[PDB]
């Protein structure tokens, strides 16, 4: 078991994670006939997907695997908490870790921390806003719905794309690969909100390596290897970009 797993993790270290991702995304972009339906159906059976929650519950009505993978949910099935003083969950999934940011240190697994500055690609200014703050980390399974929504009202201020690796973020590697989320390719979004500044960070993984936001479209791929920054005004301004509590902000996808 402990050595079975150290083989499972050598597999993480040995199989070419980016190549497998470009292959998956290549085929998940293709409009193949019965083939994409076949792959969807097995995926659905294997992972026990719940198509009754899908807006379009028939696997035949998805033109590609990716379209299925990013399928819209039924508006009725995810009601948004209407109190203006509570913040809603941003994504379907399960909580990995959550709590207090112990002076720049965030918990990855018990016996594994990572720094706020590492997660934030070296940006001490942005790291300053959240030192001794709170964090929540959410893991979206392949079963789950793969779009992400706003936990409260927000004015978009800053977006940063960070190049990085494509380790799996199954929770085996969460307990042995140091700096998992500070190492994997990811996209950082900073909001002004009535609860202070707020960050929502979208971390890729092997296969599920493509990340988009509603204001930008697909951010990666292509994988250009460099860090990119975009900024937006303070709100109530020309060019300002805002979203309200529970609005779709981005999504995950194969490639």
């Amino acid at each position: 078991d402990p050595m079975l797993n150290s083989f499972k993790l050598s597999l993480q270290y040995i199989l070419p994670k980016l190549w497998l991702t470009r292959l998956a995304g290549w085929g998940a972009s293709k409009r193949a006939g019965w083939l994409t339906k076949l792959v969807i159906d097995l995926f659905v059976k294997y992972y026990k997907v719940d198509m009754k929650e899908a807006q379009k519950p028939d696997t035949a009505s998805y033109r590609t695997f990716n379209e299925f993978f990013v399928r819209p949910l039924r508006d009725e099935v995810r009601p948004i908490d209407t109190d203006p003083n509570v913040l809603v969950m941003p994504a379907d999934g399960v909580i990995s870790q959550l709590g207090k940011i112990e002076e720049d240190k965030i918990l990855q697994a018990k016996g594994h921390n990572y720094s706020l500055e590492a997660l934030l690609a070296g940006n001490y200014l942005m790291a300053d806003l959240f030192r001794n703050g709170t964090f929540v980390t959410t893991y979206l399974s392949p079963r789950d719905y793969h779009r992400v929504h706003m936990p409260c009202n927000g004015i978009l201020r800053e977006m940063i794309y960070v190049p990085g690796d494509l380790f799996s973020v199954n929770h085996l590697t969460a307990q042995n690969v140091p700096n998992l989320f500070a190492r994997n390719e990811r996209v950082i979004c900073l909001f002004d909100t009535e609860f202070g500044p707020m960050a929502q960070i979208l971390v890729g993984a092997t296969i599920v390596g493509s990340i988009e936001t509603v204001w930008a479209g697909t951010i990666t791929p292509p994988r250009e290897g460099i860090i990119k920054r975009w900024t937006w005004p303070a709100g109530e301004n020309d060019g300002s970009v805002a979203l309200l509590k529970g609005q779709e902000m981005g999504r995950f996808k194969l490639g």
Binding site: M89, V94, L98, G133, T134, Y145, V148, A199, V203, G246
Partner: protein, 35 residues
């Protein structure tokens, strides 16, 4: 996959019921203002 959220030091309190591996459904509550 993974979304990480970060909040300011004293501006937010989060549900006492929520721990690791707690199911997360989009609309439900995650934290409440300290005000």
């Amino acid at each position: 996959x993974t979304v990480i959220n970060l909040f300011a030091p004293g501006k937010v309190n989060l549900v006492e019921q929520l721990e690791s591996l707690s199911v997360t459904k989009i609309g439900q509550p995650l934290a409440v203002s300290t005000e």
